[PDB]
Design a protein around this nucleic acid. Structure first.
Ligand SMILES: [Zn+2]
Ligand SMILES: [Zn+2]
Length: 52
DNA sequence: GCCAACGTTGGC
DNA sequence: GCCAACGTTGGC
């Protein structure tokens, strides 16, 4: 839907820890104000263009 | 009950 | 139209 499930981004299991979306996550110390997937896990086909 | 990450929205 | 922010809820 937002995932094709077979590109590199869809197959990734590990958040990069360094992009703006990761730095937002509570797991990396952020405020959880943004709340999107890691930039490297944004489906290359289906994701909003601005999320890649 | 919590939570990942989606779709919606307000302010620009 | 963009995008920061956050209500939402399927899945756990
Ligand atoms: Zn990342
Ligand atoms: Zn994909």
């Amino acid at each position: 839907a937002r995932m094709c499930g077979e590109c590199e981004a869809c197959r990734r299991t590990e958040d990069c820890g360094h992009c703006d979306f990761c730095r937002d996550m509570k797991k990396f110390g952020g405020p959880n104000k943004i709340r999107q997937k890691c930039r490297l896990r944004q489906c290359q086909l289906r994701a909003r263009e601005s999320y890649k």
